[PDB]
Amino acid sequence: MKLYCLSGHPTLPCNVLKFKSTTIMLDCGLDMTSTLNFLPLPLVQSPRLSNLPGWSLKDGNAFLDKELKECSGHVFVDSVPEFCLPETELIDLSTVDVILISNYHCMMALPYITEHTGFTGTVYATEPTVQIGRLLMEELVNFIERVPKAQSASLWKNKDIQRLLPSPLKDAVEVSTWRRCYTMQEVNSALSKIQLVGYSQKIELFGAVQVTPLSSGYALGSSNWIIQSHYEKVSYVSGSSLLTTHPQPMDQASLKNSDVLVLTGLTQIPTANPDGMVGEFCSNLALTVRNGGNVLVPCYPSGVIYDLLECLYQYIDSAGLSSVPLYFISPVANSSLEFSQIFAEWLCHNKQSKVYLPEPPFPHAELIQTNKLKHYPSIHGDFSNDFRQPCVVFTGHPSLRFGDVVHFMELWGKSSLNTVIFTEPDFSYLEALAPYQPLAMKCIYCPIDTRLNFIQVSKLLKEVQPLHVVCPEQYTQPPPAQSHRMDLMIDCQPPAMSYRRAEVLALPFKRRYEKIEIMPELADSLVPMEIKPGISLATVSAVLHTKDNKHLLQPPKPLLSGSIPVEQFVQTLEKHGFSDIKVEDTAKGHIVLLQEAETLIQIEEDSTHIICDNDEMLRVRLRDLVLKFLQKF
Amino acid sequence: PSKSAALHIDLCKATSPADALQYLLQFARKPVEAESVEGVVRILLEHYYKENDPSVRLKIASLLGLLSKTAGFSPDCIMDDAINILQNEKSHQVLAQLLDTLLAIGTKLPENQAIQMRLVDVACKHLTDTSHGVRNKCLQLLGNLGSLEKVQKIIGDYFSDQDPRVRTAAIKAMLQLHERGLKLHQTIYNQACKLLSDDYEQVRSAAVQLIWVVSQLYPESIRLVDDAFGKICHMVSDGSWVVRVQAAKLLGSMEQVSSHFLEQTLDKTAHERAKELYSGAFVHGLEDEMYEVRIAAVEALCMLAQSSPSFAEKCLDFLVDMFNDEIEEVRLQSIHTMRKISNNITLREDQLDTVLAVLEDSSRDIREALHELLCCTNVSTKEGIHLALVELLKNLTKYPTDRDSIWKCLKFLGSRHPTLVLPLVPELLSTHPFFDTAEPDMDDPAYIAVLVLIFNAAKTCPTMPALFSDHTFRHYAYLRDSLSHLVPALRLPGRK
Amino acid sequence: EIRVTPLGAGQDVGRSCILVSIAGKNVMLDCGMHMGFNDDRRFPDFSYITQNGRLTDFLDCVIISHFHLDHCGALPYFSEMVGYDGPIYMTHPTQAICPILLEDYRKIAVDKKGEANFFTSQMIKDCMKKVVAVHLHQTVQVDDELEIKAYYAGHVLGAAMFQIKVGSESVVYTGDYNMTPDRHLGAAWIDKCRPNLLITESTYATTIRDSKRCRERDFLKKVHETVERGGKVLIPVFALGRAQELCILLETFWERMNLKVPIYFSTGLTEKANHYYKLFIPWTNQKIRKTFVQRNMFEFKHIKAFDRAFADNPGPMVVFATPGMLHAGQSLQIFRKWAGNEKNMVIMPGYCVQGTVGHKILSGQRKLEVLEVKMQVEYMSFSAHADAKGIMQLVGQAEPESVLLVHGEAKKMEFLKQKIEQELRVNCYMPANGETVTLPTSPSIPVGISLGLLKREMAQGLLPEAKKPRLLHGTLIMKDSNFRLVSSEQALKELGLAEHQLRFTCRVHLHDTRKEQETALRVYSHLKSVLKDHCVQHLPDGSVTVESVLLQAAAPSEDPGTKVLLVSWTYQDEELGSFLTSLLKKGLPQ
Ligand SMILES: [Zn+2]
Ligand SMILES: [Zn+2]
């Protein structure tokens, strides 16, 4: 069973597994870290972004001052932001049968694969995952659009120049395969190729395999996949979170008893304590608002935002800051809020009960009804009229490379009272903020993560006891941040064989048994017989019918095994009618002579030879006499 | 040069999963040869192909297929690939890549016989796999390799093979065979009769296409096209929703069918109850899960209604009733189909219902579509014209923004059948017999609306300027001066 | 085998409750009451399931289809007084809706009957604490072998079929369901499960419901003309189900026509019905679940809570009212208020209970109690049940092997059975309440198998030698746990038994003058000429080989006229060995 890893990212995997006569791809991860290398996409051109000085090739042969620009002694490319892709050329994706989705973050890259390659297979995902994915892709398309930055810097992409270019540009990967953002017609085609699935729905593929999504708990609708035939198990776990959260609690029960366990999407900041760091969030926000500045907060309009909003809802009354309003600005803010409200069956038990007691499960509905929190499509329009200060503004894109956050933060950077508070842990906020540096704005880094940490990983591995474990090489090797620490690298027995970007692996498994069904008529017809204690066997004879890779047997050459004792041979010959049979012994066998037809039989260990005259009736009589002194196989 | 350097680098690296993968990715990612050196590169790649870990070989075959698009390679690559396939039988993936490369070569340029499409086809046929290795891909290979206008036997057996995926592959190959003609035999009809009931998705989805395409060729079974249409009908209620789209579209495209059997689709009614008061496939297809199938149904109905001059009268009620569908797309499609079948059709009592819709909130598209429908409909009863006139006046007085279309629809409604309006002339414009009526305002866009009808009707009937009152003559001159694309020239004495 | 015992709804309606004994497991589908029997006979009998013991001992799990009283009304009674702690399965909407209806029915019983032994609010809360939720198509493992699956039904929001499957045996219980899509609920949909048994309703088995679109067209025309004439409109429909469908239809038509006349909806159950229909969007079909992105169809712009004092208000009006049965009739209040006027309309979109004010109004007599009714009544039919064509289509789609009808009348039961037996050639039944019916199963035992044997056997089948019995052989190793089918050699190696070889050597006597030296060559030439397509070879040592049969010219015998040919063969090729001996008995060509 061959496993292909087509994305070196430790959190946004793309894994093509092969099983029986089927090929299954898991996840379509869009490494949106690569976008960091490009300049921001302003909503309105600002002089400082416009007039940035040009980095120059030291040789000067190439005219790279136009492509590259430098700020704070650093270098950035200058074009429309870009995105890295999974390496699609390892295997023709067109031969891929089924695609599975883990979570809205892991399905971000879906259109590229679903449309361009000619993929004709089906796609599976949970209802909230597909909806919120259609929301995020809409947001991304809108952000990249709305200010088409036509420029296309391509000379820098060359490998030879890339070698000379300074860091981090030296650090780019597969710079060649980068592709511009997709469009809405592709998005619609992708989302229309999808088909839905609920939790624990046992989807059978051609009878060839059986796939099941199980509650993960990371976010609202994230699913850990389980692929099984009747005698195997491959558990693909991507982004679970056993902490106490709003999504449906993680179910480890079915995970145990797994042949192969693919593990992905561990935490990003292992040392981060979610609860204490949310406390730091609230304290810092309160202090800044009391100082009277303005607070900016980048965050995807989903996921962690809702937990953050519950915490803020409970904490605001603690300091009595009712005066300061919360603005939530994004082209999908309203839709995301309503979709979070409707999905009750997927939330935690507490919230499902809050629904059974008629009331909207989340409290941000109560916030909106109270008018403390106001959601707006984008800064242009009504928000401009209804602005206030001081305030707390939830922007759209935490990549800091585009959206409404870039404009707000070019607006507020000059001041020092104002503060930007990072929460989404997916991007190195240092590189994120590099282009805007210098900045008087106080920068606070409190990155909230909820994915399982290494200790819980060890617990789960011991609880499930897998036959094999497969994880990214980043986990196996200790993080570069703390080479000293040992808890920061995964541990298992046998050791988790690792992998890297664009790698091919062969699982240490062999196909031995598979499932086939007998039919009752033949079952009744068959008569078991025993040779050993507790072992009853019977020779079989039938015709197989195969449908949809499912096999069945119905009624329409076995051989011999076992020595024939000469004493019983002669006894049964005499009691059946034979006479004048004389037996002599040899070193290891017996020679028995029957006078009729002059039949001589030599019986040795695992050897019996009969020699008679040209006879047919007596020959067949001897055949049926001797064959019935053993067990037929 | 570059190819030789790449081959040397790959040989030097000799790293099992690292060097080969990196070299293949770089070579494919960077660029094509764009020269005759493609043959040398292919020879070098085949030289290293003798190795282990068939993943590298598969990647090399993919690179070869990509390079084959350059059109530079011809018979050398074909011979090399045939030789490699003759002995490279290892697992399914390697044969898969080899078959893909062979297909690329075959359809890339040669498109010819003489071991350009025949030898490869024979080799693929002889290389039939045991377990899903190439089966589908070799089927589509022979599908794109059309032997001649004389092959169907092999696919005949393969239809009832193991895997539904292979069944779909055979079906698509059959489609490719048909699209080049090939005069498919009749027995495929009877063979696909069972394919209809395959009890798996993605199979029937194209089995329906096959039954349609074979049926439309020639209607001779015992009734053949009628039988196939009956099969499609019995299928229209398929469990899925994806099938029904093809089901509807294909029966719509079909055009010739037995009349008597055609109405049996629509036969079940409150509609006939209303008709008396004044005096099954589509029946279910029209009301289905999601609007896609409704759109397909209305399109099929409009197509075959156009085809058959009869059967239209039976479908007017089924169209008109389905106006308040709540899906604007279905709204618009219903209006469009009614327009497209509006000919030799009567609305003895349907007038009021189809006109009630004219009052929509704004629905500018819907109301404009209704005007378009009216300008091309037909009515037979004078009271019908009167009724349409009064509802149009209400429309104009409530939505004073589309008068510019109200006038044109009235113009056509007059020109289409003039004599119907002649009895209305005394009544519609006040002409109190022995009182001189006060000049109605010249520019009022209700008086202009009712005048344009009369003037357009007046081209035909010579007697009616007698009915025309005092003002109407100078008013006609003013209209004919203002709106020259609504009122034609007439015989009036004032403007000779 | 399958045992089915309907404790209710046996050629009848109401208090539906089915017991299924399958593969030694007892599952109780649905447990509700029904009106009309003020005695305890309304509730399902329990003296047969467990007599007078502990229910959990015998029962395995309780399944609830939807929240209609006649299905979900016995939950407190069955699970609190009688005593049950086992799992109760029901979809989230059913779980959220049934408690309110149960509380209302409890209050109604207190107010009208006042039965001493009647479940109390605390007890309903305790019962509902013992529920378990199920989403669409979610297979829930009741135990290690029994699993239940749900499906979208659409009889009301959250209604669901259930597929109770064990091993290969499976029974599909549909309960109340609709196959005609409504204006807010999608039609019931199912897989091709091919169950052995299928329980279904027949509430409208004798009525082919006509085109719903045209029916509602007529309804809307009538309401429009009624509002035009200045009269008032009273629409009695019980607060759940049909009320919201009417509300959606009227609201959409109303917004389109831009009419302004205010419309009121009966209070009391609105505050809960709308809230649930708003929080449970992901059940309400494609139109709503799509349009939800911009607006939420259940936040009504022009429908407002009704007020009693508005009854006297002049001008044309539209008001919904409760209950649909008019027995108590908060609707009946306005009906009595306006009965004199002939301008007003009233619509009864459902069947009334015979022998009640519902039937009195159904019949056209003015004197209905003695007060005279004058306004006009229209007896419409907006029921959300299954039409005969719906049942036939659903059974055809599921492709079952045996059907079983409940939830209806005996005579219609008979008509439907006759038609279905004639049509689909499928077994049918008609269990009367309390009658157990047994049906035989096909418990095919599963077995394991080695991959390679199957692979080569399928390769042989692929080879164009089919239609000739290839006699799939081997042996079944039994452990009482994992029956595994294996090939002969694999079983030999696994069990360690010796590979016994059986050899027969026959002395063919050839009587001819030909030389002994050429005898072997003659044998080779004759066998190669006779046995076509057989591997016939002449070894360098003078022997002959035919497949695996070795023919050797033995040493000269004491009889000059007799030559001995040893034909030695194994048991496996003993067929060809015997054939060779028979052929050689005829003698070599001379
Ligand atoms: Zn019901
Ligand atoms: Zn019922």
The string of DSSP letters for A181-227 reads ---HHHHHHHHHHEEE--TT--EEETTTEEEEEEE-BSSTT-EEEEE
Burial class (CB in 10 A: 0-12, 13-18, 19+), A160: exposed
Q: How far apart are the CA of C65 and the centre of ligand 1, in A?
A: 9
- C-alpha pair distances (Å), C543 with each of A488, B22, C489, C513, C518: 75, 61, 30, 20, 11
Cα-to-chain-centroid distance, residue C375:
46
Q: Experimentally, how was this structure solved?
A: cryo-EM
Q: What are the φ and ψ backbone dihedral angles of C372, each rounded to 5 degrees?
A: -100, 130
**Helix, strand, or coil here: A100?**
strand
Nearest to C236 by CA among C306, C178, C185: C306
Instruction: Read off the DSSP letter of residue A249.
Output: P
Longest dimension (CA), chain B: 115
Nearest to B102 by CA among B72, B131, B140, B128: B140
Distance CA B174, CA B180 (A): 10
Distance CA A538, CA C475 (A): 5
Here the CATH number for the domain that contains residue A369 is 3.40.50.10890
Of B270, B290, B291, the CB nearest to C215: B270
- C-alpha pair distances (Å), A74 with each of A184, A436, A540, A562, C162: 35, 11, 77, 85, 64
| SS3 labels along A31-91 | CCCHHHHECCCCCCCCHHHHCCCCCCCCCCCCCCCCCEEEECCEEEECCCCCECCCCCCCC
Tokens read off for B256 = 């010739």
For the CA atoms of A123, A124, A126, A130, the dihedral, rounded to the nearest 10 degrees, stands at -10
Neighbours of ion ligand 2 (CB under 5 A): C 70, 176
Cis previous bond, A148, omega within 30: no
The string of DSSP letters for B90-149 reads -TTHHHHHHHHHHHHHHHHTT--SSSSSHHHHHHHHHT--SSSSSHHHHHHHHHHS----
Answer for the pair C352, C329: CB distance below 8 angstroms, yes or no: no
In angstroms, what is the resolution?
Answer: 4.2
Distance CA A318, CA C331 (A): 50
- Bridge partners (DSSP) listed for residue C521: none
Picking from A6, A18, A21, A173 by the largest number of B CB atoms within 10 A of its own CB, the best residue to mutate is A21
Instruction: Read off the DSSP letter of residue C353.
Output: P
Answer for the pair B476, B495: CB distance below 8 angstroms, yes or no: yes
- C-alpha pair distances (Å), C133 with each of B302, C25, C95, C198: 47, 21, 8, 23
Cα-to-chain-centroid distance, residue A92:
20
User: Which residues of C fall in the annotated binding site for Zn(2+)?
Assistant: 66, 68, 70-71, 155, 176, 407
Q: Angle C410-424/C388-398 helices, nearest 10 degrees?
A: 40
H helix or E strand, kind and range, residue A405: helix A404-412
Answer for the pair A523, C444: CB distance below 8 angstroms, yes or no: yes
Distance CA A613, CA A609 (A): 14
- Bridge partners (DSSP) listed for residue A468: A260
In angstroms, the separation between the Cα of residue C214 and the nearest Cα of chain B is 6
Distance CA B269, CA B312 (A): 18
Q: Which ligand is nearest to the CA of C155?
A: 1
- Bridge partners (DSSP) listed for residue B12: none
Contact criterion met (CB < 8 Å) for B359 and C181? no
Distance CA C269, CA C185 (A): 20
Answer for the pair B335, B372: CB distance below 8 angstroms, yes or no: yes
Question: What's the length of chain C?
Answer: 590
H helix or E strand, kind and range, residue B243: helix B242-253
Distance CA A447, CA A426 (A): 9
Please list every residue in chain B whose beta carbon sits closer than 8 Å to the beta carbon of residue C191. Answer: 239
Tokens read off for C212 = 């719903």
Q: What are the φ and ψ backbone dihedral angles of B196, each rounded to 5 degrees?
A: -50, -50
Nearest to B375 by CA among B399, B398, B397, B358: B358
Cα-to-chain-centroid distance, residue B184:
24
Here the CATH number for the domain that contains residue C346 is 3.40.50.10890
**Helix, strand, or coil here: C261?**
coil
Question: Which range of residues forms the domain containing residue A294?
Answer: 274-445
The string of DSSP letters for C192-206 reads ----SEEEEE-TBTT
Q: What are the φ and ψ backbone dihedral angles of A403, each rounded to 5 degrees?
A: 110, -165
Instruction: Read off the DSSP letter of residue B470.
Output: S
Q: Which ligand is nearest to the CA of C68?
A: 1
Buried b (16+ CB within 10 A) or exposed e, A296-327: bbbbbbbbbbbbbbebbbebbeeeebeebbbb
Please list every residue in chain B whose beta carbon sits closer than 8 Å to the beta carbon of residue C220. Answer: 324
Q: How far apart are the CA of B294 and the centre of ligand 1, in A?
A: 29
Buried b (16+ CB within 10 A) or exposed e, A363-380: bbbebbeeebbbbbbbbe
Distance CA C251, CA C85 (A): 45
Cα-to-chain-centroid distance, residue C74:
23
Picking from A559, A615, A620, A628 by the largest number of C CB atoms within 10 A of its own CB, the best residue to mutate is A559
Distance CA A503, CA A5 (A): 5
Nearest to A147 by CA among A296, A39, A67: A39
In angstroms, the separation between the Cα of residue C257 and the nearest Cα of chain B is 6
R_g of chain B, CA atoms, integer Å? 35
Distance CA B224, CA C278 (A): 52
H helix or E strand, kind and range, residue C140: strand C140-141
- C-alpha pair distances (Å), B490 with each of B409, B447, B466, B480, B495: 20, 19, 14, 10, 8
- Residues in CB range of C268: below 8 A, 6 or more apart: C239, C322, C330
Q: What single letter denotes the amino acid at residue A237?
A: V
Phi-psi sector, C497: left (phi>0), alpha (psi -120 to 50), beta: beta
- Residues in CB range of C530: below 8 A, 6 or more apart: C583
- Bridge partners (DSSP) listed for residue B457: none
Answer for the pair C403, C420: CB distance below 8 angstroms, yes or no: yes
In angstroms, the separation between the Cα of residue B97 and the nearest Cα of chain A is 9
For chain C, list the contacting chains (3+ Cβ pairs, <8 Å): A, B
Question: Which range of residues forms the domain containing residue C279?
Answer: 212-379
Q: How far apart are the CA of C74 and the centre of ligand 1, in A?
A: 14
Tokens read off for C199 = 């329980």
For the CA atoms of B23, B24, B28, B31, the dihedral, rounded to the nearest 10 degrees, stands at 30
Question: What's the length of chain B?
Answer: 496
Distance between first and last Cα of chain A: 33
Burial class (CB in 10 A: 0-12, 13-18, 19+), B309: exposed
Nearest to B78 by CA among B39, B133, B127, B125: B39
**Helix, strand, or coil here: B76?**
helix
Q: How far apart are the CA of C439 and the centre of ligand 1, in A?
A: 27
The string of DSSP letters for A438-493 reads S--SEEEE-----S--HHHHHHHHHHH--SEEE--HHHHSPPGGGSS-STTS---S
Angle, alpha carbons A171-A177-A183 (nearest 5°)? 120
Burial class (CB in 10 A: 0-12, 13-18, 19+), B275: middle
Answer for the pair B210, B195: CB distance below 8 angstroms, yes or no: yes
- The residue whose two tokens read 């760091």 is A277
Q: What are the φ and ψ backbone dihedral angles of C149, each rounded to 5 degrees?
A: -125, 145
Side-chain-side CA neighbours of A398 within 13 Å: the count stands at: 25
Answer for the pair C146, C61: CB distance below 8 angstroms, yes or no: yes
Contacts 24+ apart (CB under 8 A), C540-546: C544/C520, C546/C576, C546/C580
**Helix, strand, or coil here: B306?**
helix
Residues of C that are catalytic: 201
**Helix, strand, or coil here: A401?**
coil
Nearest to B41 by CA among B7, B75, B68, B85: B7
Q: What are the φ and ψ backbone dihedral angles of C21, each rounded to 5 degrees?
A: -100, 110
Contacts 24+ apart (CB under 8 A), C534-543: C534/C576
The string of DSSP letters for C27-70 reads EEE-----TT-TTGGGSPP-TTTTTTS-HHHH--EEE---S-HH
Distance CA B447, CA B475 (A): 10
- C-alpha pair distances (Å), A227 with each of A20, A100, A571: 11, 11, 60
Tokens read off for B370 = 């209704």
Contact criterion met (CB < 8 Å) for B59 and A549? no
Contact criterion met (CB < 8 Å) for A95 and B165? no
Neighbours of ion ligand 1 (CB under 5 A): C 68, 176
Distance CA B427, CA B382 (A): 12
Q: Tell whether B255 is within 8 A of chain C (Cβ).
A: no
Q: What single letter denotes the amino acid at residue B377?
A: T
Distance CA A566, CA C44 (A): 73
Cα-Cα-Cα-Cα dihedral sign, residues C333, C338, C342, C344: negative
**Helix, strand, or coil here: C233?**
strand
- Bridge partners (DSSP) listed for residue C566: C507, C552
Contact criterion met (CB < 8 Å) for C455 and B289? no
Closest residue on chain C to A346 (Cα): C135
- Bridge partners (DSSP) listed for residue A203: A211
Of A513, A526, A613, the CB nearest to C484: A513
Cα-Cα-Cα-Cα dihedral sign, residues C298, C304, C305, C306: negative
Going by their DSSP bridges, the two strands C371-372 and C367-368 should be labelled as: antiparallel
- Bridge partners (DSSP) listed for residue A543: A554
Answer for the pair C342, C377: CB distance below 8 angstroms, yes or no: no
Q: What single letter denotes the amino acid at residue B487?
A: V
Nearest to A18 by CA among A90, A108, A104: A90
Instruction: Read off the DSSP letter of residue A383.
Output: I
Distance CA A462, CA A471 (A): 16
| SS3 labels along C269-314 | CHHHHHHHHHHCCCCCHHHHHHHCCCCCCCCCCCEEECCHHHHHCC
Distance CA B142, CA B176 (A): 9
Nearest to B370 by CA among B359, B382, B378, B383: B359
